[PDB]
């Protein structure tokens, strides 16, 4: 069946927004970095590796606002043993109603696709914020593209997107504004 259960009472009337993790909200690496925001131990083949995570500028303000404007859902092509701890440390305000990982993506011709139709929401009221266009090849008309982030601390894309999301949260059909 569907990836998500019915939307909770207070969320039922909100637009559902799937938010990507890597290169969208944070950037991680196995190469030690002094200014990492999070260091997370990830076990692979019995060996514990340390992953250094950097937060994208304004992500906290971004997640807090989005959390109250939409029914936010984390959808990533990364493994839970990596992404679950990051989301635990990152999402302080419980903006994420659900979290979906690699196993929930559809592997289609070399790419892990975020197939929005498996979500179980009315696509007229669903949006995806992902840095990789290949992620939403099945629903390019629900996409609110955002540039890939790695470490540019001068980035302000998340901050500047809020006005747009503020407007979308009001419409009753995202296609009406996203062309479809």
């Amino acid at each position: 069946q569907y990836l998500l259960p019915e939307a909770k009472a207070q969320d039922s009337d909100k637009i559902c927004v799937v938010i990507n993790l890597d290169e969208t909200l944070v950037h991680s690496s196995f190469k030690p970095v002094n200014n990492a925001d999070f260091i997370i131990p990830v076990e692979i083949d019995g060996v514990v590796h340390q992953v250094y995570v950097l937060k994208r500028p304004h992500v906290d303000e971004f997640l807090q606002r989005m959390g109250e404007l939409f029914e936010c859902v984390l959808f990533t092509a990364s493994l839970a043993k990596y992404a679950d701890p990051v989301a635990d440390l990152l999402d302080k305000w419980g903006a994420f109603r659900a979290r979906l990982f690699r196993e929930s993506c559809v592997f289609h011709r070399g790419n892990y696709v975020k197939d929005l139709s498996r979500l179980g929401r009315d696509l007229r009221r669903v949006l995806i914020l992902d840095n990789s266009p290949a992620s939403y090849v099945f629903h390019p008309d629900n996409a609110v593209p955002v540039a890939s982030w790695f470490d540019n601390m001068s980035d302000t894309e998340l901050h500047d997107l809020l006005p747009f999301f503020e407007q979308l949260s009001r419409v009753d059909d995202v296609y009406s504004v996203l062309r479809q």
Binding site: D22, E23, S78, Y82, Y112
Partner: peptide
């Protein structure tokens, strides 16, 4: 790969 491919 643990992160997004």
């Amino acid at each position: 790969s643990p992160t997004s491919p």
